[PDB]
Amino acid sequence: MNQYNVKYLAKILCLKTEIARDPYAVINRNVLLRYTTDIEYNDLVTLITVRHKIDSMKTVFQVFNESSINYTPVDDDYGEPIIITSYLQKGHNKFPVNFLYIDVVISDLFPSFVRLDTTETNIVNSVLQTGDGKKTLRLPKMLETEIVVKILYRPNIPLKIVRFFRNNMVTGVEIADRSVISVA
Amino acid sequence: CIFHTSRYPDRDSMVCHRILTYGKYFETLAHDELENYIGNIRNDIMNN
Amino acid sequence: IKNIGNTKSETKFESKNNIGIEYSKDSRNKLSYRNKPSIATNLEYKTLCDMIKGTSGTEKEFLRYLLFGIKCIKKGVEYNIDKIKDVSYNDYFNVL
Amino acid sequence: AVISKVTYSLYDQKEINATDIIISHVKNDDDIGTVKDGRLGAMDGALCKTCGKTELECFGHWGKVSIYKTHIVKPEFISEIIRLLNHICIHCGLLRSREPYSDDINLKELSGHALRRLKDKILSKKKSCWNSECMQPYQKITFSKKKVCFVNKLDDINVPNSLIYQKLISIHEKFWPLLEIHQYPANLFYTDYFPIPPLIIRPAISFPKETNELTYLLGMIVKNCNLNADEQVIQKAVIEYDDIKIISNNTTSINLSYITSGKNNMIRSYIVARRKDQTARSVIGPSTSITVNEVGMPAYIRNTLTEKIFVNAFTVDKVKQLLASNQVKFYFNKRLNQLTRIRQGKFIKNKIHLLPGDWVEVAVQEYTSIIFGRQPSLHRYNVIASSIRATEGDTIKISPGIANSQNADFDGDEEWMILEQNPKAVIEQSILMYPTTLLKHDIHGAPVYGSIQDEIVAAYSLFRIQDLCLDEVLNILGKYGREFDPKGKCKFSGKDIYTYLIGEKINYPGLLKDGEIIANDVDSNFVVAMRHLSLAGLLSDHKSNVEGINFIIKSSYVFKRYLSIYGFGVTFKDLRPNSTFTNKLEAINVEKIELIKEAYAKYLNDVRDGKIVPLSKALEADYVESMLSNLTNLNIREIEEHMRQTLIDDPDNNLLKMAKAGYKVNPTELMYILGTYGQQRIDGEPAETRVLGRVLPYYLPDSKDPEGRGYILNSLTKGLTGSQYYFSMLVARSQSTDIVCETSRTGTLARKIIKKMEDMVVDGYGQVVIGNTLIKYAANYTKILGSVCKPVDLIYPDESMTWYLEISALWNKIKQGFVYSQKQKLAKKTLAPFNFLVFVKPTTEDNAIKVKDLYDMIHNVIDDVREKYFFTVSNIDFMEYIFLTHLNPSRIRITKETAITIFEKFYEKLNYTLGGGTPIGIISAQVLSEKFTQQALSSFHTTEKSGAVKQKLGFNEFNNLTNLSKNKTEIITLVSDDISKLQSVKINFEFVCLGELNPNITLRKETDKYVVDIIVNRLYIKRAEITELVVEYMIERFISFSVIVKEWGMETFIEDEDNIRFTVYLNFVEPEELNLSKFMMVLPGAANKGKISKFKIPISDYTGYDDFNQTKKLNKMTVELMNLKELGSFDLENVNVYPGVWNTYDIFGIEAAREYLCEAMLNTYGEGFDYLYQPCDLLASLLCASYEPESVNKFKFGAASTLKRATFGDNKALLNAALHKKSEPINDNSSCHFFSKVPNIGTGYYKYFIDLGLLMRMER
Amino acid sequence: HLTQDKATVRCRGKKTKLIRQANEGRKRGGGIKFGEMERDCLIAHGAANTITEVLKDSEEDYQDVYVCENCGDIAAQIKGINTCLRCSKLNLSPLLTKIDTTHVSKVFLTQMNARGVKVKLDFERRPPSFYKPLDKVDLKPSF
Amino acid sequence: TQSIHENKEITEILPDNNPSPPESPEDRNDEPPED
Amino acid sequence: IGNHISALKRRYTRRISLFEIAGIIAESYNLLQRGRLPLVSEFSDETMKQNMLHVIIQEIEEGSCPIVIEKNGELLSVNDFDKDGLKFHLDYIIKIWKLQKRY
Ligand SMILES: [Mg+2]
Ligand SMILES: [Zn+2]
Ligand SMILES: [Zn+2]
Ligand SMILES: [Zn+2]
């Protein structure tokens, strides 16, 4: 955890707040225009306060290093500690240092993605069938440990398909879908 | 040449080469065959 | 300047500088701990006692830049490389 | 009767034993019992003694030889055995662990992670036997490769195969999943008998016939079997019979593996390729009596090739008449599968009976379709099926209209012909491979046929001729002048002729208006193939390809009639009427070069004295280069002004006619001919000095003369001198050698790409899929044929438009992808579905459709198509944006009929154009391969020298991208608007050494010390962009950690206003003088900072886009790194970072990696190749189809078939499939070709039946 | 370089013994080779039947060949009876089925069997299908 | 020449010269070690 | 909502391209060439004096073409495709055949 990568993580802990508010929102850079952040750094526990401009509602994240974790809920706590780890590991609140060498969210290569609801999922499943009995096609794959999957996480809503709005040079925007496969 | 490599005649330069004409092929072949002939004679005498 | 190193991980140098460059790439040529100075010098200054010990951050850099500036002022030079004028060669290559 | 699944496995021993043919002797009276006896099959003039049939109907039988108690290892699986000996204890034969020997755990209800972890633990045990049964250390057995036997590394002790066999067989089945054993360990050895293959695969070698090598090796095996010898002899014989390369290193001996040796496999030289019977090849030539649909055939080929006529109720009488007239050459009796060569008066008439289903072969007839082409076949248009026309001579005649599509000319080229007469093939040739069907290119859509060379000039001239009477117009028109209508005129222009030729009233912005040309002139872009303004293309878009082909034929005819009537020729007096201009330009050059030399000499003399600090070598070269470039541009301007003046004075100059028409002439070529030849470069730089600081001995040592390093002053009219000629030939020969090397490499890359994408097609719902995976929802983003879609201008929102709010909303929805390339490019084009612009006609504001009605029509049509043809998934806002902006009432008014026609054409294109089974993937692969091959072979790209890190263009970069090699440096780019954040990184990463600053190091010795003085001039420090304290830190850091210095001290002095003196006091460790010399030798280069690399790290500026009307200024820098770890402590907040492919995959994900690959691959091509975006997008989408990127050299994640791998060139896939017992279906093109099945491509994408219901309801 | 020194044409002729294909050599009346780049081009046209017939043996060289569904051996014909010797020796009665492949395929598979790899083929036995009337569809827009 | 729709122009890449078709094929220790 | 998409896809199945009609014509022509019985109306000794391609086109147009094609898990006769697309492709094919001297 140092004094710089916390300023990179505070941006991810605004997309996570958005998803906490509305699990079916579209996530990309522009979401940051609706939030403000305040950071208090320390070598043991860092405090990140995220504020929604229109609602004026606060969310407080406590950031620890992997080795030393001393977590006690505070006012408006996010309800779960944020952990910076040495390597990539499973868990929606665990982020490797590899993810925080640069300001990730604002790069031109950060994706734009969303979670499909039940109706859209049924439409996709129906579209994938070949019409010959029950044979069906398969969407391409993506690992469960990607930062996209970490940002889109809700405890009681399993995630199976993620929809991406690709930049397209000739049509502007394009739509693609991927299926999330578990990692042992 | 260790310190100024580019100023020393390169290996592909024609400055450091010579050329074989018709006669030299035959000369070299005669040399080699004469040596092999004498070697075979020596080995035969030693074996006998 | 902070500690940025190199390891044996194509370049065309002058071959008189390349010997030292490739010598420096072998970690076997460096001591494991810094070897402090042992010959006294700069006897006309006391800020060295301040920089040599204790100050081990931006304060050290500030003090040594101050020392350089003081030397320049005593000598009577600009002491600011930005404020020195660089000769312009366009006076030779402006023809045509 | 349809093959649907193929399974591989290893034979059982009892299966090998199940044969009654036993081989015992190496010789015998009649080979009986030998490796050559007849029971194994038939041979030259001898029936098979088993089935009693000749060679043509006997496929052989199996034998065996006896081996006496000698277990034999199968060579190919030798390594496998080693892998199985590292999982068990040799002495006691038990696994190297104990957990598997536990009843508390049942392996049946667990797999994957559990088994893998247990196997990992078992392998990692690697310690003296845990069990006390033997309590022995574990050994490490390996095949010696010099002695044909297994030996232990610790002790050079031969381990008999019997022991290994006994240990391996003991393993129980329940532990196989842990060891990845599928069938049986016992199947890896032969125990009681060794098989002897039939005679089919080893016929006698003819040219007395020599013995076959495989027969010889089998006999050698047999010789050592009955002898009752040691296992080593038999094993070595078996290995050299099967695979000699296991032990030896010679790749010339023939054995079983020779079939899959290398590029000369059996599959890729006889299964997916072969020689045929109805073929020919000959030189080509031009003909004006042949259209693009036809090909002329020489007599000597017509009298040899033959065609088939089937006997049925329709043709029986004609066949009888042909037999009567002695015109039948062959007859085939289908009920006997018997072919007879019907002679001319030398045969029987009764032998013919003409039952239905038979056929006869006669001489080939005109208008029969024949396949023909030119090699190398780089893309689809090199092989086509055309109608036969009789011609004269012994050359194959083609129309010049197809020359470009094949890259052919008539300086000695050749072409080949084949004739397939199966009825299905006949129909498919007539429809699918007909040139009229291939008019529009698959990707960019332009026509592939057109005029060439002098025709172009004729076109340009025809449009300009003014005063013609009716007779002259008709003389030009020729046989197409019957329908010409001299309405009421008596004088005609060339515009009238062009209007007549374009028999349509269509409008297209720029070119046409009411079927008339409104441009200023007609040029190459109008009548040449692959151009973006072709009139045939517009005609095809309006109606169909038939109209386009008709226009091509007719226009070519009239152009050549213009050439016949008026002629065309370039003379010497057109190029150089006299010696005024050339002399003027020569004098100008002679003066300017001397001025440059004097300037350079003045600078050198000033430096040679103490007046200025010299420049760096690079900067001095840059200044000289700038002066020479200024001179070259001066010559260019002179040539342009001369061209203009000559056009004024002599308007009928043929050379300037060629220049204007757009054919091969421009100011640069004329500069070469009449002006100057300019700087010659190799690898973007002039020739290098070699011996005395010079290139040739015509210049003094260390010469600074520019002319002596490759700047040529003369022109071709003047004539080059000897040394200028040397430099020119240097460039030429380097080009040719590079061409040869690239010709070698590009073919390999192209084949790999083609093999990878070959099986990607469009399914029955307009989706792009490969195997069982969905690649893309909408084929071309439109579910329309690719050659029908049309690029069109992109019109940014504006407040003067009619439906402004809706257009701005659509733009805000789709603008994300229109700013690309690190925010320094704004898109200018989009893709419209079908080129509606030829259907648009303006009207007079009262007969027009109402605004509200037009908006409703557009909106409702888009919603309907969105739900009915894209199934509510894809996003087609770009189509609606195009329709709202290109038909905006503030821009143009149209009638209701025009709108209805436009949308009806839209629906027709949606319904009838794209169909399932389209080979989209292979077409994309061929387009990319042909493009980079042709760019490589014509030296399209030119190398350049740069001071900062750049990504290169050309074939090499594309190959690097496709390979996806790991563990290399990546070019990380950083862009920001606050320059301090970049300056910090630059100062901490840019490499500087003391030797670069041109110091003045001196050394002296005093009692108890050595004093070293380093004097540095401030200007070099400033140019290096550092401070004095940076240099001091470099020196101090090097000295402090040195291992050859004992005592040290430092100080600094200001010598004067422009020098700094660093003084070092030293005492070295013993030995003294040796270390002193080493220190003085290594000092200049070992005092440095930053990351070692050959590139500096400058910071540049450029203007970037936030939108179409918002702009910003950004600072940029580039640096090469293995990864981004070093950056983790540099405060790069609000800094845009662009890493390489593997770093972006690791940080962002697979989608970002796919995007990076697509963009980089497109960039490797150059500037004006935007249309290649669609193919690349597919290829990238293929590489990132799994959850991780995958190279193009490996089948790692894709579930490729064993035969697919073998055809790709694996050479070991079949053995692994046998070992693992893989069962596969048959869907690939390779698998289908192997078994003679119809690929699931095009017509073969469907399955056909026959409905007998109606036939059985008829009664005689 | 003269035309008649480069002209070539073939209708029928000899074959190579091992693989039974057209021989090589202009002076020996050999044929022109159909390479796999031409094969790629023909697949790019979508003409599946054309390439299928190009890569196959001549229809005039057909003959009946049977294969044992159990082990993949080409069943021999003894006294006019099809029989798989290997499986008969083991007291088995496997099904013999007719195949239509190229000679070089048989050579390749036999040589692979020599090295120890067993190649087994199955055949498709799809159940019968029946045609049913289908209602009409228009597909035109509402204008 | 003239410019109408230069933003959609397509460039031509076709070599002028191509290779003619192929025709029918038809110890004294006296050398350096060359390490 | 799956039923809606299924219906849309079933309707989508009925569009016709060049590959399918070319395959149907190829099958019919091969079978007729090798000696099957034409299924035209008014079959008589005069039917054998026409051109086989005229016979095939007539069989298609009058709805007596025996070829059945499988596309998306269904079985379609040449008359179950959209009629306008059939006319469109047949017009193109007949034009180019006339250019070749086949029709
Ligand atoms: Mg040529
Ligand atoms: Zn036999
Ligand atoms: Zn043991
Ligand atoms: Zn069998």
Swiss-Prot record, chain B:
List the subcellular locations. Virion
Name of the protein in its database record? DNA-directed RNA polymerase 133 kDa polypeptide
The text of the family note is: Belongs to the RNA polymerase beta chain family.
Give the protein's function.
Part of the DNA-dependent RNA polymerase which catalyzes the transcription of viral DNA into RNA using the four ribonucleoside triphosphates as substrates. Responsible for the transcription of early, intermediate and late genes. DNA-dependent RNA polymerase associates with the early transcription factor (ETF), itself composed of OPG118 and OPG133, thereby allowing the early genes transcription. Late transcription, and probably also intermediate transcription, require newly synthesized RNA polymerase.
- Highest taxon of the lineage: Viruses
Complex and partners: The DNA-dependent RNA polymerase used for intermediate and late genes expression consists of eight subunits 147 kDa, 133 kDa, 35 kDa, 30 kDa, 22 kDa, 19 kDa, 18 kDa and 7 kDa totalling more than 500 kDa in mass. The same holoenzyme, with the addition of the transcription-specificity factor RAP94, is used for early gene expression.
State the organism named in the record: Vaccinia virus (strain Copenhagen) (VACV)
UniProtKB/Swiss-Prot annotation, chain D:
| InterPro entries in the record | DNA-dir_RpoC_beta_prime (IPR045867), RNA_pol_asu (IPR000722), RNA_pol_N (IPR006592), RNA_pol_Rpb1_1 (IPR007080), RNA_pol_Rpb1_3 (IPR007066), RNA_pol_Rpb1_4 (IPR007083), RNA_pol_Rpb1_5 (IPR007081), RNA_pol_Rpb1_clamp_domain (IPR044893)
Task: Name the SUPFAM superfamilies on file.
Answer: beta and beta-prime subunits of DNA dependent RNA-polymerase
- Origin superkingdom: Viruses
> Transmembrane stretches, by residue range?
none
Q: Which UniProt keywords apply?
A: DNA-directed RNA polymerase, Nucleotidyltransferase, Transcription, Transferase, Virion
Gene3D superfamilies named in the record: 1.10.132.30, 2.40.40.20, 6.10.250.2940, RNA polymerase ii, RNA polymerase II, clamp domain
User: Is this entry keyworded Metal-binding?
Assistant: no
Q: Which enzyme type, at the first EC level? A: transferase
Which SMART domains does this entry report, sorted A to Z? RPOLA_N (SM00663)
Name the record gives this protein: DNA-directed RNA polymerase 147 kDa polypeptide
| Naturally occurring in which organism (per UniProt) | Vaccinia virus (strain Copenhagen) (VACV)
UniProtKB/Swiss-Prot annotation, chain F:
Question: Would you say which domain of life the source belongs to?
Answer: Viruses
Bias kind Pro residues: ranges: 18-26
Give me the ranges of the annotated region Disordered.
Answer: 12-35
Give all cystine bridges in this chain. none
Q: Where is the signal peptide?
A: none
Q: What induces it?
A: Expressed in the early phase of the viral replicative cycle.
| Compartments reported by the entry | Virion; Host cytoplasm
**The protein's role, per its UniProt record:** Part of the DNA-dependent RNA polymerase which catalyzes the transcription of viral DNA into RNA using the four ribonucleoside triphosphates as substrates. Responsible for the transcription of early, intermediate and late genes. DNA-dependent RNA polymerase associates with the early transcription factor (ETF), itself composed of OPG118 and OPG134, thereby allowing the early genes transcription. Late transcription, and probably also intermediate transcription, require newly synthesized RNA polymerase.
Q: What family does the Swiss-Prot or TrEMBL record give for this protein?
A: Belongs to the poxviridae DNA-directed RNA polymerase 30 kDa subunit family.
User: Quaternary arrangement and interactors, per the entry?
Assistant: The DNA-dependent RNA polymerase (vRNAP) consists of eight subunits encoded by early viral genes and termed according to their apparent molecular masses Rpo147, Rpo132, Rpo35, Rpo30, Rpo22, Rpo19, Rpo18, and Rpo7. The same holoenzyme, with the addition of the transcription-specificity factor RAP94, is used for early gene expression.
Its recorded name reads DNA-directed RNA polymerase 30 kDa polypeptide
Task: Please tell me the species this chain comes from.
Answer: Vaccinia virus (strain Copenhagen) (VACV)
Gene name per UniProt: OPG066
Swiss-Prot record, chain G:
Q: Which residues of the full protein are shown?
A: 62 to 164 of 164
**Protein's GO biological process:** DNA-templated transcription
Q: Does the keyword Transferase apply?
A: yes
Q: Which GO terms describe its cellular component?
A: DNA-directed RNA polymerase complex; virion component
What task does this protein carry out?
Part of the DNA-dependent RNA polymerase which catalyzes the transcription of viral DNA into RNA using the four ribonucleoside triphosphates as substrates. Responsible for the transcription of early, intermediate and late genes. DNA-dependent RNA polymerase associates with the early transcription factor (ETF), itself composed of OPG118 and OPG133, thereby allowing the early genes transcription. Late transcription, and probably also intermediate transcription, require newly synthesized RNA polymerase.
| Transmembrane keyword on record | no
The record lists the organism as: Vaccinia virus (strain Copenhagen)
Q: Which domain of life is it from?
A: Viruses
Question: For this protein, what reaction is catalysed?
Answer: RNA(n) + a ribonucleoside 5'-triphosphate = RNA(n+1) + diphosphate
Q: What is this protein called?
A: DNA-directed RNA polymerase 19 kDa subunit
Keywords for this entry? DNA-directed RNA polymerase, Early protein, Nucleotidyltransferase, Transcription, Transferase, Virion
Q: Where in the cell is it found?
A: Virion
According to its UniProt record, which protein family does this protein belong to? Belongs to the poxviridae DNA-directed RNA polymerase 19 kDa subunit family.
Per its record, what triggers expression of this gene product? Expressed in the early phase of the viral replicative cycle. Expression seems to continue throughout virus infection.
Where does the protein principally reside? Answer: virion
Tell me, what is one Gene Ontology molecular-function annotation carried by this entry? Answer: DNA binding
Q: What class of enzyme is it?
A: transferase
**Which Enzyme Commission number(s) are on file for it?**
2.7.7.6
